[PDB]
């Protein structure tokens, strides 16, 4: 089949700028003046959305900032100016040969100013203590960039075994991130300690942001 | 007319035809003297038959010149069919001459009179030398394909006739028997017809709008490949024919889905039949109701 | 108004068969083709097949021996049927309306996640997450809904039946011991909580579990 | 074989044809025999002319039977060309013979022989009256205004007039050069008669635009260009397959969003009103 | 050109019912199995909206209750079930021959339960009086059917000279009607009389609805 | 987001030229045809013409001598020029995108109303209408707005900048003395008047008149 390679696999661009995504085909996907290559955009938790068909035609109802170009084997999708709503994964699909094949995908990173995380700590709930477990949750909302460090101190001692991290995708309205760190434990382990702290190391400030609670 | 000669000597085949025709006409002048020197009875008939030979060469040369003419409103495909038609007319004429070697043959077979004034086996030898030059020049004979084929076959028929008359002359002179001459004549007629048959078969097939033989065996695979295209429902009204040598015209109608990618189907069908060897293709796409 | 909805089993046992029914509205299957395409984190997007308005079907050569697409125009639905389901077939499946006269897919369904595993469906366990005592009240206050021990994906988490949408941060789930863990966070004005009612609604269609948990201060 | 017993009785037009080919070929054989018995070559040439006149009709009947054959993979257009080819072939075989006759004729220009059979006057007048019968009370044998009369009557009665004049000139005045020039004149008449059939056949076999279609095509092209969304026309080819059956092909460039169903239906309507039986319209969408 | 005749010019159909509109073409609008006949819907104050193209194919994004049928010269647009939003004009357009031609139109009036008008009298405003004229207004809202009569009485004296009538089209929600009856007078004519009354005679009731004002 | 806007002169003097400009968004002029169609009460809908993506233009035969259509793809504009504007040319003019591969029109602009006359433009006169005294208060109350003395059509009447839409009944205009009258009526709960403010916004683009009249109690 035809193999489509998308370069770069990830690209970071700032607001009111131009983002260029390149797709390359092993063989020509063209016939008689038409390149049968189509660009899709898939947002987080959404089906792919058709942006370009036949490599240069704007879909009916998509914003004019999207454009396509190229022929034969090399194709380019250009977003200009880049808005905050464009944080998604962009794919190229060929229809010149059976079977239809898609590109590897390229994530669009919307660069903005760094934001200090909003850190909140939540202790295990009463129903959770009745069940038999105990999970302490640290929510880190509205921070930038994505890279961040989360550390749990259990009565001032280091914990790295029962820590589970979850990152949301980049926000479509303010280009921020959310970070959920769950520290799950059994009953005796939770009852043996009193003070639980969750600290966040971020590039915004050298001093980590620490949220603490007792019992 | 001044520029007409420059086109003749430009192309290789037309120049070769013109030079062979000029050599035939020079031999015609030589015989014309030799025969107005009071040897008319057989010499002048030989001259008029070989003037007919020059007429066939002129037909081939004219077809070669005309095939290169530019296409116009009346002649949309050009004048390339003159390449085929010449190969037809040269072939059929040879069949005609074969009968002339057959009937006249029995004129020498059952009829005892052997009245003969061949010019002391001199014109026959020179004519056979001419035939050797002709078969040497047009060795590629056996758009200038059916012209060269017909010209080569005509030259070979001439060579066979020269072999027949020379063999008969050496038979009656040394061996002294007379029955060899009708046998040689009828054998030469048979060989002429046998050699002519394939060219006539190809020319008739082309003029009868038949499917090209070198394209017939690959057409069903092309049909299946076109049928395999996404959104093609059916194929109909397929027609492939030969315009001139190696030039194939094809036409077909596709039924497709009501929302099919007609641009892509067209490009794929044209690729499929370009790989098969078709040069000029017409694909009519009809969208189905459902 | 053009839309496509797929109904299929979220959990499929290995070596069994998967059947999805895509119902379409806003267009007719008498003049539109429908494609079936799956997406997985492993191999990305993969084209499975297409069915045409007359009933012609075109498959991928990798799935030709185990895939069947059928349709009914009058009731306007398309049936996707795959056999010999293996672990690599866990993916989000999409029925897509083809772009007319093009080789693109112009409309897509929301897509159904199909998981091929031998585990058993487990109803979710829903817990609240209130701020510790009343410290750090501020102008804004965060609340959480924590879902543990559900299988398989997905689960729909909303706040106040979807009336409250801003400040909602649902996180990607995580597998451990063949069970899923999910967190959801919400930021609300301090004058809103606990003065009026805030709740987290969790829907697990695989086990058909509906939870309407009331978040309360400690 | 036995089925022809009742066919010969119920025919009227086939009866006329049967009687025509019965007397024409028989008298061609008679004239050939008397020409070989004598040394006259005008008689032999006239016999060859009427023999090929009858072989034209026989080949036409055979070609009609072949043309009614069902098409197949090799012959997708059928065997419908077998009519034109047949006529063409007969024409060629006529011209060659005239081309031969002339040659042998001018041979006797140099050394004229003189042989009489005391029946040459009888058989030439009888050949003339046979030709008159077959051209007037039979209406067959038409070899093709002034050109129409030349192709119809003169082309096949002037040969008989020439052989009659040679018979008079050989026995009454006694000159020896009557038949060598009569044979040459008969050859010229043969070639002149065959020219128009060869012209029509060659035009068809050259894939030429049909003459009855040629003057209406520019209006057809103007009407196709007048359709909305059509940008240009390309590569139009129209040719005669067989009598009154025309094949046309063309390529249209249209707008990138043009109504191809409607343009296709309108183009087919336009060229059907022009008399084109088979039409292939390829439609290409433009980029801009 | 091609003349399209739409029958009937107006048609009334109740809720959850079927409505059939016929378009007849002077000549055939067909080619090669396709009829190039299209159906548009135009609501009040809006551009026409394409419902059907090529006489049977539903436009992408229209309700399934619309249907098309026919061939050659006769075509039928069918609404089943008829809703309240179907109150509009329906046109047929041919595209088989240049120039494009439309139908004359067919108004679909939605048949509903009978309603009594709400009648309001508005006296001429003070600013209007200072301008130099007087305009008394009668508003009749939410009544069915179409037929209604409005009479102006000036101290019990009929006035059928300066009465101007304005009628709205059928509402797309409740299929009712609104009527405006205005009476224009000079300042002296307004100041001569005291009591003005509007009387509305409708099919729903036998006693006409009377409203009045003084000075 | 496919949208077409027509901008043109509402009033054109007789025997002059009308120029309309249609701006499109959501689709390129490089692959769609644009039709021009006018609608009037007398002749119904007439097709004026079409311009194609390469610049080819097909006109109506009855307007071939006094019509011109041009376009600019970079700016996405289509220009409609008509000459010798006689009396029966008063109509609403629409630019419509052509439905692809079909002879129908899929999207229409809102249209520009063009009235041809020798009468001059007249700014409107806006009069509010409160009920007489306080009789028949009920739970429902009517307010009125008269726009009298304007030319030509149309005028846009809104209520509280379009915030309230229910119960509004804008009546067709009436032509007398070659001037226009218009009435608007609003149904509103009695507790909401005269408690808060309700205003009648009248926009006349021909004279560019913006009135924000206040309905004051009588
Ligand atoms: Zn004859």
User: Strand, helix or coil at D200?
Assistant: helix
- Cα separations in angstroms, A4 against A1, A23, A166, B267: 10, 6, 31, 21
Are D35 and D27 spatial neighbours (Cβ–Cβ below 8 Å)?
A: no
Phi/psi at F132 (5° precision): -65, 125
| CA–CA separation, D240 and D213 (whole Å) | 9
Please list, residue by residue across B97-122, b when 16 or more beta carbons sit within 10 angstroms of its beta carbon and e when fewer do: bbeebbeebeebeeeeeeeeeebeee
Say which residue the tokens 């039986």 belong to.
Answer: D277
B70, with CB counted inside 10 A (0-12, 13-18, 19+), is exposed
Q: E strand or H helix at E23, and its extent?
A: strand E19-25
User: Which stretches of D52-181 are assigned E, i.e. beta strand?
Assistant: none
- Within 13 Å, how many C-alpha atoms sit on residue D16's CB side? 11
What is the number of other CB atoms lying within 10 angstroms of the CB of residue B78? 20
Contact E125 F127 (CB under 8 A): yes
Chain length of chain D: 288
DSSP state of F154: -
DSSP bridge pairs for C6: C22
Comparing CA positions, the residue from B254, B280, A34, A53 lying closest to residue D284 is A34
Chain D interface test: which of A30, A34, A69 (most D C-beta within 10 Å):
A34
Q: Which of A89, A17, A96 is nearest to A53 (CA)?
A: A96
Q: Which residues of C fall within a CB distance of 8 Å from B260?
A: 33, 52, 101
Phi–psi pair at C12, nearest 5 degrees: -125, 130
| Pairwise CB contact (< 8 Å): B231 & C52 | yes
**Strands of the E177-186 sheet, one edge to the other:** E118-122, E133-143, E177-186, E163-167
Whether residue F31 contacts residue F101, with contact meaning beta carbons closer than 8 Å, is answered with no
Q: At what angle do helices B12-36 and B145-170 cross, to 10 degrees?
A: 30
CB A122 within 8 A of CB C130: yes
**What number of residues does chain A have?**
215
**Whole-number Å distance between alpha carbons of A44 and A170:** 9
Residue E72: CB atoms within 10 A of its CB come to 12
Q: Which residues of chain C lie closer than 8 angstroms to A133, CB-CB? A: 148
Q: What does DSSP assign to residue F151?
A: B
Q: Residue B262 and residue D251: Cβ atoms within 8 Å?
A: no
Cβ distance C113 to C92 under 8 Å?
yes
The span from the CA of C53 to the CA of C34, in Å, is 8
Cα nearest neighbour of D202 on chain B:
B85
Q: What are phi and psi of D146, to 5 degrees?
A: -65, -40
Tokens standing for residue E106: 């067919």
The DSSP result for B206-234, as a single string, is HHTTPPPHHHHTTHHHHHHHHHTSTTEEE
Q: E149 has which bridge partners?
A: E201
SS (H, E, C) chain C: CCEEEEECCCEECCCCCEEEEEEEECCCCCCCCEEEEEEECCCEEEEEEEECCCCCEEECCCCCCCEEEEEECCCCEEEEEECCCCHHHCEEEEEEEECCCCCCEEEECCCEEEEECCCCCECCEEEEECCCCCCCCCCEEEEEEEEEEEECCCCEEEEHHHCCCCCCEECCCEEECCEEEEEEEEEEECCCCCCCCCEEEEEECCCCEEEEEECCCC
Task: For residue E184, give the 3-state DSSP assignment.
Answer: strand
CA F208 to chain centre: 13
Q: Quick one: three-class SS letters along F189-217?
A: EHHHCCCCCCEEEEEECCCCEEEEEECCC
Burial state string for A93-132 with b = 16 or more CB within 10 A and e = fewer than 16: bbbbbbbbbbbbbbbbbbebeebebbbbbbbbbeebeeee
Chains that touch A (3 or more CB pairs under 8 A): B, C, D, F
**DSSP, residue by residue, E164-180:** EEEEPPPPTTT--EEEE
Return the axis-axis angle of helices B40-67 and B2-10, rounded to nearest 10°: 90
CA-to-CA distance for A67 and A81, rounded, in angstroms? 11
Sign of the alpha-carbon torsion through A60, A64, A66, A70: positive
Buried b (16+ CB within 10 A) or exposed e, D40-64: bbbbbbbbbbbbbbbbbbebeeebe
Asked whether the CA dihedral F156, F161, F163, F164 is positive or negative, the reply is negative
Resolution in A: 2.7
Angle at A106 between CA A102 and CA A109, to 5 degrees: 155
Distance of CA D171 to the CA centre of its chain: 37
In 3D space, the residue among D177, D120, D129 whose CA is nearest the CA of residue D157 turns out to be: D129
Tokens of F153: 């059509």
CA dihedral sign of residues F39, F43, F44, F50: negative
CB < 8 Å to E164, chain F: 174, 176, 181
Q: What is the largest CA-CA distance in chain C?
A: 67
The size of chain F, in residues, is 218
Q: Helix B81-107 and helix B40-67: axis angle, to 10°? A: 160
Q: Which residue has the tokens 């007409």?
A: B4
Mutate to test the interface with D, among F2, F28, F33, F99 (most CBs of D within 10 A): F33
Strand partners, F159: F200
Q: Tell me whether residue D136 is exposed, middle or buried, using C-beta atoms within 10 angstroms of its C-beta: 0 to 12, 13 to 18, 19 or more.
A: exposed
Half-sphere exposure of E138 (CA within 13 A, CB side): 29
DSSP code for A95: -
Nearest CA to E147 out of E122, E164, E165, E172 is that of E165
Q: How far apart are the first and last CA of chain E?
A: 61
Of A58, A61, A63, the CB nearest to F28: A58
Report CA(D142)–ligand 1 centroid distance (Å). Answer: 7
User: Does residue F129 contact residue F183 with C-beta atoms inside 8 Å?
Assistant: no
For residue F194, whether the previous peptide bond is cis, meaning omega lies within 30 degrees of 0, is yes
User: If you ran DSSP here, which 8-state letter would residue E97 be given?
Assistant: S
Length of chain B: 290
- DSSP letter, residue E100: P
| Separation in Å, CA E46 to CA B103, E40, E109, E113 | 94, 12, 17, 26
Peptide bond into F154 cis (omega under 30): yes
Q: What letters, b where the CB count within 10 A reaches 16 and e where it falls short, cover E180-192?
A: bbbbbbeeeebee
Q: Which two tokens stand for residue C89?
A: 């077939």
Whether residue F19 contacts residue F79, with contact meaning beta carbons closer than 8 Å, is answered with: yes
- Measured CA to CA, the distance from residue B64 to residue B17 in angstroms comes to 9
* Neighboring chain B residues of C97 at a CB cutoff of 8 Å: none
Extract the tokens encoding C40: 């997985």
Name the phi and psi angles at A36, rounded to 5. Answer: -90, 70
Question: Cβ of F2 and A62 within 8 Å?
Answer: no
**Distance in angstroms (rounded) separating the CA atoms of residues A204 and D205:** 87
Where residue F35 falls (left for φ over 0; alpha for ψ -120 to 50; beta otherwise) is: beta
What is the separation of C-alpha D283 from the centre of its chain, rounded to a whole number of angstroms?
Answer: 39
C-beta of residue C57 within 8 angstroms of C-beta of residue C51: yes
Contact E67, E55 (CB under 8 A): no
Q: Is E52 helix (H, G, I), strand (E, B) or coil?
A: strand
DSSP string over chain B = -HHHHHHHHHSHHHHHHHHHHHHHHHHHHHHHHHHHTT-HHHHHHHHHHHHHHHHHHHHHHHHHHHHTSPP-SS-TTTTTHHHHHHHHHHHHHHHHHHHHHHHHHHHTTT---------TT-HHHHHHHHHHHHHHHTGGG---HHHHHHHHHHHHHHHHHHHHHHHHHHIIIII--STHHHHHHHHHHHHHHHHHHHHHHHHHHHHTTPPPHHHHTTHHHHHHHHHTSTTEEEEEEEEEEEEETTEEEEEEEEEE-TT--HHHHHHHHHHHHHHHT-SEEEEEEEE---
Cα angle vertex E54, ends E52, E55, to 5°?
Answer: 65
Contact (CB, 8 A) for C50 and C68: no
Diameter over CA atoms, chain D: 88
Residue of E nearest to C76 (CA): E64
Alpha carbons B76 and B94: distance in angstroms, whole number: 31
Cβ-in-10-Å burial (0-12, 13-18, 19+) of B217 comes to exposed
Chain A environment of B260 (Cβ under 8 Å) = none
Q: What are the residues facing C59 on neighbouring strands?
A: C49
Question: Which DSSP string do the residues of A104-170 spell out, in sequence order?
Answer: --EEEEEE---B--EEEEEPPPHHHHHHT-EEEEEEEEEEBSS--EEEEEETTEEE-SSEEEEEPPP
Q: How far apart are CA B15 and CA A22, in angstroms?
A: 57
Q: Which of D235, D238, D234 is nearest to D208 (CA)?
A: D238
Question: Is residue F126 a contact partner of residue F149, using CB atoms and an 8 Å limit?
Answer: no
Nearest to E97 by CA among F48, D231, F52, D228: D228
d(CA F115, CA F14): 10
Flag whether residue D260 sits within 8 Å of chain B, measured between CB atoms.
yes
Give, for D53, the enclosing helix (H) or strand (E).
helix D42-67
Nearest chain A residue to C62 by CA: give it.
A99
CB < 8 Å to F185, chain E: 120, 139, 141, 178, 180
Most distant pair of Cα atoms in chain E: their distance: 75
Helix, strand, or coil (residue F118): coil
CA-to-CA dists, residue F35 to D117, E3, E51, angstroms: 92, 20, 17
- CA D11 vs CA D1, D6, D8, D19, D170: distances in Å: 17, 9, 6, 11, 44
- Which residues, at least 6 apart from B124, have a Cβ–Cβ distance to it below 8 Å? B118, B162, B165, B166, B169
């Amino acid at each position: 089949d035809i193999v489509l390679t998308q370069s770069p696999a990830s690209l970071a661009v700032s607001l009111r700028r131009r983002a260029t995504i390149s797709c390359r085909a092993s063989e020509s996907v063209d016939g008689y003046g038409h390149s049968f290559m189509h660009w899709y955009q898939q947002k987080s938790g959404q089906p792919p959305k058709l942006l370009i068909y036949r490599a240069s035609n704007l879909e009916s109802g998509v914003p004019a900032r999207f454009s396509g170009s190229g022929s034969r084997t090399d194709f380019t999708l250009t977003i200009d100016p880049v808005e905050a709503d464009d944080a998604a994964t962009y794919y190229c699909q060929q229809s010149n040969e059976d079977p239809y094949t898609f590109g590897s995908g390229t994530k669009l990173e919307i660069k903005r100013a760094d934001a200090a995380p909003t850190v909140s700590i939540f202790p295990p709930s009463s129903e959770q203590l009745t069940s038999g477990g105990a999970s302490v949750v640290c929510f880190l909302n509205n921070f930038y960039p994505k890279d961040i460090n989360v550390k749990w101190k259990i009565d001032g001692s280091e914990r790295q075994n029962g820590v589970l991290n979850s990152w949301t995708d980049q926000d479509s309205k303010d280009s921020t991130y959310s970070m959920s760190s769950t520290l799950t434990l059994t009953k005796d382990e939770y009852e043996r300690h009193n003070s639980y702290t969750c600290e966040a190391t971020h590039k915004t400030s050298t001093s980590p942001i620490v949220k603490s609670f007792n019992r | 007319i001044s520029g007409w000669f420059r086109s003749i000597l430009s192309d290789k085949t037309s120049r070769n035809l013109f030079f062979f025709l000029c050599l035939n006409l020079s031999f015609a002048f030589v015989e014309l003297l030799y025969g107005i020197w009071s040897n008319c009875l057989g010499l002048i008939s030989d001259s008029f038959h070989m003037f007919f030979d020059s007429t066939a060469i002129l037909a081939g040369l004219a077809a070669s010149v005309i095939s290169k003419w530019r296409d116009n409103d009346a002649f949309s495909y050009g004048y390339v069919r003159a390449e085929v038609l010449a190969g037809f007319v040269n072939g059929l004429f040879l069949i005609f001459t074969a009968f002339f070697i057959f009937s006249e043959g029995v004129e020498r077979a059952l009829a005892p009179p052997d009245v003969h004034h061949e010019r002391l086996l001199l014109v026959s030898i020179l004519g056979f030398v001419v035939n050797l030059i002709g078969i040497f020049v047009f060795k590629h004979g056996g758009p200038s394909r059916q012209i060269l084929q017909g010209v080569f076959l005509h030259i070979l028929a001439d060579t066979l006739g020269s072999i027949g008359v020379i063999a008969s002359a050496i038979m009656m002179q040394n061996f002294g028997l007379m029955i060899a001459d009708p046998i040689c004549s009828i054998l030469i007629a048979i060989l002429i017809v046998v050699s002519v048959i394939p060219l006539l078969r190809e020319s008739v097939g082309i003029l009868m709008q038949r499917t090209p033989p070198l394209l017939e065996n690959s057409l069903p695979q092309c049909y299946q490949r076109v049928q395999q295209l996404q959104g093609v429902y059916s194929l109909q009204e397929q027609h492939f024919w030969t315009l001139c040598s190696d030039v194939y015209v094809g036409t077909l109608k596709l039924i497709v889905a009501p929302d099919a990618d007609a641009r892509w189907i067209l490009s794929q069908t044209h690729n499929i039949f370009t790989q098969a060897g078709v040069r000029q293709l017409y694909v009519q796409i009809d969208f189905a109701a459902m | 108004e053009v839309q496509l909805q797929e109904s299929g089993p979220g959990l499929v046992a290995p070596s069994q068969s998967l059947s999805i029914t895509c119902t379409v509205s806003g267009f007719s299957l008498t003049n539109y083709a429908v494609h079936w395409v799956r997406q997985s984190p492993g191999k990305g997007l993969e084209w499975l097949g297409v069915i045409w308005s007359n009933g012609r079907t075109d498959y991928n050569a990798a799935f030709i021996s185990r895939l069947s697409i059928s349709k009914d125009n009058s009731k306007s639905q398309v049936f996707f049927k795959m056999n010999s389901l293996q672990a690599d077939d866990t993916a989000i499946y999409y029925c897509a309306r083809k772009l007319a006269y093009e080789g693109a897919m112009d409309y897509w369904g929301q897509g159904t996640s199909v998981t091929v595993s031998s585990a058993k469906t487990t109803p979710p366990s829903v817990y609240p997450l209130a701020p510790g005592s009343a410290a750090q009240t501020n102008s804004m206050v965060t609340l959480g809904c924590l879902v543990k021990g559900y299988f398989p994906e997905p689960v729909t988490v909303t706040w106040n039946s979807g009336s409250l949408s801003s400040g909602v941060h649902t996180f990607p789930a995580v597998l451990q011991s063949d069970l899923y863990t999910l967190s959801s966070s919400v930021t609300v004005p301090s004058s809103t909580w606990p003065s009026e009612t805030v709740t987290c609604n969790v829907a697990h269609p695989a086990s058909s579990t509906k939870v309407d948990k009331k978040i309360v201060p400690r």
